[PDB]
Amino acid sequence: MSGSIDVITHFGPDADKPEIITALENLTKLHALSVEDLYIKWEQFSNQRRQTHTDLTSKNIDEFKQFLQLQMEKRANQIILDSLNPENIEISSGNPNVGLLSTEEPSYNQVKVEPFYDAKKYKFRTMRQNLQEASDVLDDQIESFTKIIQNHYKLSPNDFADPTIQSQSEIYAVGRIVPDSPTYDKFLNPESLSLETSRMGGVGRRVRLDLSQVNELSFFLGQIVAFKGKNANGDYFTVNSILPLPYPNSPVSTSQELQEFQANLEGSSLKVIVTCGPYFANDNFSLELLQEFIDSINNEVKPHVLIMFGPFIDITHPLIASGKLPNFPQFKTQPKTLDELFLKLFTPILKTISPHIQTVLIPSTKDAISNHAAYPQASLIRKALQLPKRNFKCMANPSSFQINEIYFGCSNVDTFKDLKEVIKGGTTSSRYRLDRVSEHILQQRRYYPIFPGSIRTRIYEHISGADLDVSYLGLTEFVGGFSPDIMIIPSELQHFARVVQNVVVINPGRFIRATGNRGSYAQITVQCPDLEDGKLTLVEGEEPVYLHNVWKRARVDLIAS
């Protein structure tokens, strides 16, 4: 009854023929419009064709269906926990200009943050690794270290020989620590280690290592090493002594530069804050803790520089991985992508940072806001994040940059967790592991010296890893061939701050724990360089230069977030 009479009370009684009823009923069911709406649109259709005989026939209804689809598509087209050096150095007072409303240009107390790397080299295309290029990089690493060792120990080129060839005489050999078996099953012991040579040194051959004569050792996969030993039987290279790799030089500055940096801070101490993501818990996307932290940054702590490590939006976050992202009632328009999610959640909060605080952002390979998903990693696109140019600087991963005289080395890959050492001997085992790992990083002259990179698997399915682009691992080396004054490598391990070979090594820890509890951040106070206090070491030469000795004049406080 209902559809028929509804048609017959809008269309004429001529519609009583059941085929006509069925066609009009099909249209209203197809397009969800009511019978009277269909009658109105039928009247629109009857216009503009010179067709006074727009009769309610089957063919006219077919043309009306075509008209309806044309109108539809046209409408669519229309529409303090721990501390380093607390007893010797007071906490800095921070930047006095923070909190001053004054629009006036920040004339005097300008901490200069300058990158110390070529940003263009990090803008390579990812997801295309040539195996030959990767192997060339790995070979060049061995060759570069051979030259370093030869120069340092004043060895002749003829002192180096192939360790895979039988020799009764002791030889020097440089190579990469590799497993004895290519299909090794995740546990390396001292007896399961082999040395891979360079193409020039040993034609890339591998030789098993006999470390019976070595009492103390600490090795890891991918490590470049130098040995003095012999291959008497042709099967294993017996190591008699390990040649320690020389440490890189320390950065230096002239007297004039140091005086300029002293005048810039008016004799006050530099204050740097370092945070590392994630910035929200595993069960929500609340940034309340970050907001509270930024308010403290702006009103109480007042740092000169804020360094923020990613991930800001961790792609491996449980809610993202499960697709259980919540609705955000605070937003008029819901975000549609993870990039928009950053712009709605992080950008309003980060913009509240005082313009007198220089903010450095370093991405993570797990950051959804970075399309460059490989280590080494390009910087974030500041404009895409809508962050102000005045006080935000996006840096690569790893990044080397200078704050006044101080050289910072930053790498947002978890080298401390990933580096698994094969150790032997009581003295080595008694030493703190993170010191040994830090020494490995410094000796290898690369922020992530492990090869193959670490991987995380679950019951096996691949989840994540270091995600190394092997062809570009040269960009992970120390820039300029010298160690940083301060090395920052965030790790999932417990936060720490230590001095290892005159380098301040810092793990700030996670900003927030998985459970939502407070994590940690690092507050770094560095006293101003003074030529008269004796904390700087003069290096004699043609132009007198000074070692910064930041480790003697830096305090690092690990603080609850």
Partner 1 sequence: DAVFGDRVRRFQEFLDTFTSYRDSVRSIQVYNSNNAANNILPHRIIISLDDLREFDRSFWSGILVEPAYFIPPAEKALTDLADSMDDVPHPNASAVSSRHPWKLSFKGSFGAHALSPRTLTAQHLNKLVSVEGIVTKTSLVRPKLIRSVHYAAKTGRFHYRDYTDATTTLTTRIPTPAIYPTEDTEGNKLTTEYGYSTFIDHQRITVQEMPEMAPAGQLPRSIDVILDDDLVDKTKPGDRVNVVGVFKSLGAGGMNQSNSNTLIGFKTLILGNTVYPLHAARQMLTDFDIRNINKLSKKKDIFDILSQSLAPSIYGHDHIKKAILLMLMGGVEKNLENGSHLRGDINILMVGDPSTAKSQLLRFVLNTASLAIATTGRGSSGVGLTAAVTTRRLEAGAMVLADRGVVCIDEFDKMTDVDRVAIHEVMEQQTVTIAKAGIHTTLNARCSVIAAANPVFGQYDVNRDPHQNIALPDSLLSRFDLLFVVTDDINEIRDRSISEHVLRTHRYLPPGYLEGEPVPKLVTIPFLRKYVQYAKERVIPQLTQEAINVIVKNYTDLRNDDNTKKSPITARTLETLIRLATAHAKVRLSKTVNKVDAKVAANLLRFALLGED
Partner 2 sequence: ITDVERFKDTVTLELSCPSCDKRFPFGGIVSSNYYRVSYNGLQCKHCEQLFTPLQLTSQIEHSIRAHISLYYAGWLQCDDSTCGIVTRQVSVFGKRCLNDGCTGVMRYKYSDKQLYNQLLYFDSLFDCEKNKKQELKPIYLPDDLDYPKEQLTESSIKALTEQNRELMETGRSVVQKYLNDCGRRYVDMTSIFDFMLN
Strand partners, 524: 272, 556
Query: Which residue in 116, 124, 247, 482 binds partner 2 (CB under 8 A)?
Result: 124
Bond prior to 246 in cis (omega within 30° of 0): no
Question: Cβ–Cβ contacts within 10 Å for residue 206, how many?
Answer: 18
Contacts of 179 (CB under 8 A, 6+ apart): 188, 192, 193, 194, 221
Strand order in the sheet with 392-394: 82-84, 554-560, 520-526, 270-276, 305-309, 358-362, 392-394
> Quick one: 192 exposed, middle or buried, by C-beta within 10 A (0-12, 13-18, 19+)?
middle
Residue 510 near which of partner 2, partner 1, none (CB within 5-8 Å, type-dependent): none
Contact window for partner 1 (CB under 8 A) among 7-15, 56-64, 226-234, 270-278? 7-15
Q: Compare residues 38 and 290 and give the one whose CB is closer to partner 1.
A: 38
CA–CA distances in Å: residue 299 to residues 109, 389, 521, 522, 560: 18, 22, 17, 18, 17
Please tell me whether residue 126 binds partner 2 under the rule CB under 8 A: yes
Identity of the residue, 24 or 138, whose beta carbon is nearer to partner 2 in the bound complex: 138
CB of 40 to partner 1, least distance (A): 5
DSSP string, 438-467: HHHHHHHTBS---SSPPEEEE--EEEEE--
63 binds partner 1 (CB under 8 A): no
Q: Which of 467, 493, 502, 516 binds partner 2 (CB under 8 A)?
A: 467
What, of partner 2, partner 1, none, does residue 13 touch, CB below 5 to 8 Å by kind? partner 1
What separation in angstroms does the CA of 545 have from each of 92, 256, 309, 542? 26, 10, 32, 9
Which of 316, 312, 305 lies closest to 346 in space, CA to CA? 312
Among 132, 156, 169, 189, binds partner 2 (CB under 8 A): 132
Breaks (C-N over 2.5 A) in the chain follow: 79, 459
Total of residues contacting partner 2 (CB under 8 A): 63
CA neighbor of 441 nearest in space, from 471, 466, 411:
411
Nearer to partner 1, 38 or 148 (CB): 38
- 152, 372, 273: which is closest to 174 by C-alpha? 152
Can residue 468 be called a binding residue for partner 2 (CB under 8 A)?
Answer: yes
CA dihedral 161, 163, 168, 171 (to 10 degrees): 50
273: DSSP letter: E
Distance CA 51, CA 499 (A): 92
Interface with partner 2 includes 128 (CB under 8 A)? yes
Q: Which is nearer to partner 2, 304 or 372 (CB)?
A: 372
- For residue 320, state whether it binds partner 2 (rule: CB under 8 A): yes
Shortest approach of partner 1 to residue 13 CB, angstroms?
Answer: 7
> Binding residue for partner 2 (CB under 8 A) from 76, 78, 389, 540?
76
Q: Does 40 bind partner 1 (CB under 8 A)?
A: yes
CA 445 from chain centre, in angstroms, equals 19
Q: Please identify, using beta-carbon distances, which residue of 74 and 420 lies nearer to partner 1.
A: 74
Number of residues that bind partner 1 (CB under 8 A): 11
Query: Among 5, 9, 119, 241, which residue interacts with partner 1 (rule: CB under 8 A)?
Result: 9
* 125 counts as binding partner 2 under rule CB under 8 A: yes
CB of 344 to partner 1, least distance (A): 38
Q: Yes or no: say if 196 and 222 are a contact pair by the CB < 8 Å rule.
A: no
- Residues in region 189-218 near partner 2 by CB under 8 A: 196-199, 204, 206
Tokens linked to 521: 């951040």
Write out the DSSP string of 494-543: --EEEEETTEEEEE---SB-TTS-B-EEEEEEEPPP-SSSS-SEEE-SSS
**CB closer to partner 2 out of 466 and 559:** 466
CB of 43 to partner 1, least distance (A): 5
Q: From residue 539, how far is each of 147, 255, 297, 528, 544 by CA, in Å? A: 25, 11, 38, 19, 6
Q: Least distance in Å: CB of 26 to partner 1?
A: 22
Choose among partner 2, partner 1, none what residue 373 binds, the Cβ cut-off being 5 to 8 Å by kind: partner 2
Q: Which is nearer to partner 2, 136 or 257 (CB)?
A: 136
- Give the burial string for 283-293 (b: 16+ CB within 10 Å, else e): eebebebbeeb
Q: Which of 1, 2, 32, 47 is the binder for partner 1 (CB under 8 A)?
A: 47
- What's the chain's length in residues? 561
Instruction: Choose between 9 and 429: whose C-beta lies nearer to partner 1.
Output: 9
Contact predicate 45/67, CB 8 Å:
yes
Give which of partner 1, partner 2, none residue 36 binds (C-beta under 5 to 8 Å, depending on kind).
partner 1
State the binding string over 352-391 for partner 2 (x if CB under 8 A, else -). Answer: --------------x-x--xxxx-----------------
- Single out the segment in contact with partner 2 by CB under 8 A; choices: 12-20, 321-329, 533-541, 547-555: 321-329
Residue 198 interface partner, choices partner 2, partner 1, none, CB cut-off 5-8 Å depending on type: partner 2
Query: 446 φ, ψ to 5°?
Result: -145, 140
336 is a site residue for partner 2 (CB under 8 A): yes
- Contact between 36 and partner 1 by CB under 8 A: the answer reads yes
Q: Tokens standing for 188?
A: 């390396």
> Minimum Å distance from CB 61 to partner 1?
18
Task: Single out the segment in contact with partner 2 by CB under 8 A; choices: 42-50, 82-90, 238-246, 333-341.
Answer: 333-341
- Residue 172 phi/psi, 5-degree rounding, is -95, 135
Task: Report the chain's terminal Cα–Cα distance, integer Å.
Answer: 70
Determine if residue 143 is left, alpha or beta; phi over 0 gives left, psi from -120 to 50 gives alpha, anything else beta. alpha
Which of 26, 44, 296, 337 binds partner 1 (CB under 8 A)? It is 44
Binding of residue 2 to partner 1 (CB under 8 A): no
142 lines the binding site for partner 2 (CB under 8 A): yes
- Residues contributing to the site for partner 1 (CB under 8 A): 9, 11-13, 36, 39-40, 43-44, 46-47
- Residues contributing to the site for partner 2 (CB under 8 A): 69, 72-73, 76, 124-129, 131-132, 134-136, 138-139, 142, 178-179, 182-183, 196-199, 204, 206, 315-316, 320-325, 327, 334-338, 340-341, 366, 368, 371-374, 451-453, 455, 462-470
